[PDB]
Amino acid sequence: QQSTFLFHDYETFGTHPALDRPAQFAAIRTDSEFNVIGEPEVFYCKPADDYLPQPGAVLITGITPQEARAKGENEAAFAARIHSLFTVPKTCILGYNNVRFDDEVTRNIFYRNFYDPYAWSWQHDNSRWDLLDVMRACYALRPEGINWPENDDGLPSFRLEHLTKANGIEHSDAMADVYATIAMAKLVKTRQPRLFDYLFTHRNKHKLMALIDVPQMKPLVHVSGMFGAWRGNTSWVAPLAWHPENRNAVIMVDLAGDISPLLELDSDTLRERLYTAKTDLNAAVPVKLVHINKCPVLAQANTLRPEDADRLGINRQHCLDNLKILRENPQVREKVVAIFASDNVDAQLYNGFFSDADRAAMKIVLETEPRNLPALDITFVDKRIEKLLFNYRARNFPGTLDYAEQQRWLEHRRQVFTPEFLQGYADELQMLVQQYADDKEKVALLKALWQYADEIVE
């Protein structure tokens, strides 16, 4: 059995990985050096009839709901195909911004269609990775040898099209984003192999865990989009405490920040001071969760060299200052712990995990042909599952609904498709037409979206 990377990307009908629906999935499999070792996997998901797409997304993706309905398969089958691809042993599943987006879509698709929302990402030596944090780390820590493009504002751009172009790489098609992601992996691996291999090694949570010494507050380099392009997404952090609820979250302090509010203020204050940000100027609370299960970029503090800090405008001396004050102040530790100490089922993935029995029973749901779902005797403990099961049957297999179920589906469709909603949606499209009068392909997409609301709703 051989190690493979599976590059993949979704187009969806909206920004919400749970309330919005998938439109297209695209993937290619690769060997460990990024040679293509399979055929392009590209396919559509038919949206169910209880859903209208976000106009803005269709304008981006160029994919009407009409095209996805005509060329696609119901979400059950869509889930199936992805599931196979993802569950081939020794696969590293990766993409571009996939951790904060595509993986959330994947989990919701699996959750809605009775697959384990997680197992695919760690079973049989599967893992996940996200090449966006790699590009960011590369820029932050070891930029030399690659061209780093700046947007109109003057800050670094990690949009795939700028990156490829800045580096003489043809960027043309569902497959285009995927090929660009591969080309970027190649580039970083060639120009900067030791960093690339280090990050790859540290996608794993136990290797990350090894970096974290809380009693001693070992400072680390951290590269996160939360830190902002204006410091190349980088700071020195120190771990203060483990999250008291999330077993995979550790509470870090941002050492370049202002640690005065940590010492001076109490826990209640800090809780909403951290929550309601950028309204009070009242220094920011320099504190962020790092989730060892979300491929965070972490490295021993001295991999960010003095000269590297100068490059990014990071004040090395201020950081070392804040660390020394912290260490000699362990009442901040119990303080930060204290800070952390919807009726729609589609949005309830994160209401807990399903027990062994719960999850074995959803397994039978899967094994059962749609036609025999009504005739099914099994019990459920977790209260979500009935809800998922009705929605799963109505959305994918409307033919199998009995009289009282067809009625229930209707009331559900009427519930979403209110006079308020439909008039808004119609008016949205009509304004977008005006806004984009100059952009003819959009006018046409917008109009097509109108044709679709016409048929599916009234």
Binding site: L141, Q192, R194, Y198, A299, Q300, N302, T303
Partner: peptide
């Protein structure tokens, strides 16, 4: 000692 450094990794990269």
């Amino acid at each position: 000692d450094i990794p990269f």
